C-alpha cells in the first residue's frame, strides 16, 4: 500500500516535501538516506517507468508499468538487538550497489529516500540533496 506523507524529510513538528521534478543529482550524507530514483512521465500504470533502487547487497533496476505512490519511500528501522539500521518493507508502488561523503550523479523524476519508522507514527511530531 501507499502512505500519505506530503504536508501543507524534516522534523519536533513533522514536515515532508519530496516533490516530483522535471527532467545533475547529488547528495551529501553519512546516513545512506538516498536509496534510488523514479524516472518516467505519468508515473502511473498507464506508461512504462524506470525504477532504480539500491540496498545493502545489490542494486535493482526495472522498467514496468508501475503504479507509484505519491510519496514513495523505503522503510527502515533500528534493530533493537543488532543495534543497526535495517530495511523493513518497500512503499514505492502499489503495483507493477552504488549507494560527509558527497555522492554525485522520461519527463519527470522523483527521489527515493530511506524513511525511519519513527516518522511513521500517527502523531504530528517525532535528508538533503541537490538537483
Amino acid at each position: 500500500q501507499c502512505v500519505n506523507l506530503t504536508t501543507r524529510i524534516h522534523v519536533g513538528t513533522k514536515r515532508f516535501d519530496n516533490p516530483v521534478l522535471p527532467f545533475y543529482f547529488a547528495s551529501t550524507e553519512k546516513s545512506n538516506i538516498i536509496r534510488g530514483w523514479i524516472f518516467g512521465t505519468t508515473l502511473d500504470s498507464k506508461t512504462q517507468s524506470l525504477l532504480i533502487v539500491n540496498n545493502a547487497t545489490n542494486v535493482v533496476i526495472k522498467v514496468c508499468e508501475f503504479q507509484f505512490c505519491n510519496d514513495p519511500f523505503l522503510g527502515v528501522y533500528y534493530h533493537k538487538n543488532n543495534k543497526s539500521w535495517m530495511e523493513s518493507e518497500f512503499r514505492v508502488y502499489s503495483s507493477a550497489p552504488f549507494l560527509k561523503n558527497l555522492r554525485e550523479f522520461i519527463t519527470r523524476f522523483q527521489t527515493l529516500l530511506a524513511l525511519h519508522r519513527s516518522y511513521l507514527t500517527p502523531g504530528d511530531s517525532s535528508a538533503a540533496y541537490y538537483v
Partner: antibody
Amino acid sequence: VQLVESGGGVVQPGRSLRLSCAASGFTFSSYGMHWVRQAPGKGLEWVTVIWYDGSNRYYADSVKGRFTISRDNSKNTLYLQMDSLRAEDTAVYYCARAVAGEWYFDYWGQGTLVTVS
Amino acid sequence: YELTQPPSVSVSPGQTARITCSGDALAKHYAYWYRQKPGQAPVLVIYKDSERPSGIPERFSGSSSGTTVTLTISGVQAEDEADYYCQSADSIGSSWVFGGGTKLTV
C-alpha cells in the same frame, strides 16, 4: 486529558453503528487516535488508527473494508463508523490517544459496549 | 508480528512475578506493557522494554533478550492482581498488536 466514548448500543448483524469519542484537555489536532476493542472474557484487540490530520488510516484485517475511521479536528471529535456488523464484533470499544513520538497508547477513554445479536 | 504470552501466572504475595512475552518482532522493536483491572481501561506500566511512567512505582521493571521480553513485578501485592498485556507495532507503522494477556493471580 479526557476521552469520552458514546454511541454504543445493541444492533442486529448486518446493521451499522456509529461511535464517537469526544476529546478535551489537549491539542486534539496534534495527536493520532486509536480504537481498541475487548470482547468480554478476551484480551485487547487493536482495531484502527487515524493520523493527526486524517491523512492516513489503517485497519486490522478483521475489520478491513467494513469499518471507517474519521475525525473532525474542529469539534475535537473522533468517529468510528462500523458497517455490516457481525456477532464477532461484540466488544467494549475504547478510544485511545497515541503517544507523541512513540508507538504506545498513553491515554485511554472509559470504553463503550457494542453488542451485535 | 504475533505476540505470545502465557494465559496466567501464579505468585504468592511478597514474591516476584515474571510475565513473559515472545515473538520475532520483539527482537526488532520495543515492547510495551499494560495493566488492566476489571471495569477499567488498560494502564501503561512499562515502555521501551524497561522504562516506567511517573505514575508507576519502582516495583515494576522490565528486561529483554532475543525474541523474549519480561515484565518483572517485585513485592507483589493484592493490588497487582490484574491482566497484563504485551504490545508492539510493525516495522511500517500500519498495524498494532497485543498479546493474549496474562492473568496474574496473587
